[PDB]
Amino acid sequence: MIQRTPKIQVYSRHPAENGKSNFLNCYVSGFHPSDIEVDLLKNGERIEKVEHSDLSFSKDWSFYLLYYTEFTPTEKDEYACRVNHVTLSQPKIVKWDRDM
Amino acid sequence: SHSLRYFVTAVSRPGFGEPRYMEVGYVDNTEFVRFDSDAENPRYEPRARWIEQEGPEYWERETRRAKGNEQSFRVDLRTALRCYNQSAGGSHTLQWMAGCDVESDGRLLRGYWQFAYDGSDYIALNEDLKTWTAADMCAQITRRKWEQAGAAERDRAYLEGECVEWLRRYLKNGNATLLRTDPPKAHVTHHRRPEGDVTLRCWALGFYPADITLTWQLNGEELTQEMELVETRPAGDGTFQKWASVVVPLGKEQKYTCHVEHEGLPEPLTLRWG
Amino acid sequence: RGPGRAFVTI
Secondary structure, three states: OOOEEEEEEEOOOOOOOOOOOEEEEEEEEEEEOOEEEEEEEEEEEEEEOOEEOOOOEEOOOOOEEEEEEEEOOOOOOOOEEEOOOOOOOOOOEEEEOOOO | OEEEEEEEEEEOOOEEEEEEEEEEEOOOOOOEEEEEOOOOOOOEEOOHHHHHHHHOHHHHHHHHHHHHHHHHHHHHHHHHHHHHOOOOOOEEEEEEEEEEOOOOHHHHHEEEEEEOOOEEEEEEEOOOOOOOOOOOHHHHHHHHHHHOOHHHHHHHHHOOOOOHHHHHHHHHOOHHHHOOOOEEEEEEEEEEEEOOOOEEEEEEEEEEOOOOOEEEEEOOOOOOOHHOOOOOOOOOOOEEEOOOOOOOOOHHHHHEEEEEEEEOOOOOOEEEEO | OOOOOOOOOO
8 A cells, every 4th residue: 555746847838939829748657646725817817727647657556647738938927837636745836848 | 569458456445436447558578458437437548649440349348357357456455455454445556467569470578467466566467477476475365266267278378369460460550550650859958057057958859659869979989977867758639758968077068979779770879069 | 348357366
């Protein structure tokens, strides 16, 4: 019996270009159990239309999921992913950095 | 080499009642069906275009099989809680992976049929498809019951028969999608570190399948032992991305080359920033 | 097509 903390990567589907429509991604993987809370944030507010791929898991039985929304990045608008999970002491906020 | 694989998760949730039950099928690491007990009318559903040619008998039978499996998993979650003597109000997880790996000639390469309870190996069908690896006493108890029930014989019938047959049918029906290759598109970025050196980051975007090798070289010698490398991650449109970076002296960036190897490339890519 | 547990419970 094991519980695992999620890995979190925040990134865009395509290279960001100001004024150009894209997809904002939050990939959460390596976690157990499967119950997880994932929110995408625009300047700190939860984005409402966030979809996600079907839950699946890998060789070591740990789960992975992609959360995503459509967005058009700008110069100042801040994006981030917020994750909560039973193994986490605190909700984790990972901010979107457009070169990562 | 090709594979058909089903990934099944059942999660008990006392107080809201019946377990969440899921079922995701992959062909060669490509999702093509799903079942979710939390749907309003839960049923097997296509998640790839090519599986939609299947007649309604296929969809009706898979829906019923998932719902039947859900029943067994509800019982198994109660059996497990008792055998491990766990507290009654908690949520628990039974996972199951089953499937077949086959060569092009249709020979079975490996059949799988294995389970995990709360994240750890519980019981697993061995590669001979006759014997079970049972992790602890509860799973050893399960194994004795499955041995005297002839389960391995009959799971092996699925893995050698119906699993290979359906895989072979799926590769004909989904050939243009599954055997597609999408080559990486690559670029190198640069950012000054506060330490006074430079990060060179080599991106690979838009590639499929997910297997890829990124390496940095300094005058032709591999820098595996000095690079950073993210987990390969889905882009969301069916392709994958990855990057690898090295920290280099300011002024020596042009000596460093990124190497991208992918099945979709006719010759590996070589990129520089200076 | 996927595998059936066939009421072969743990």
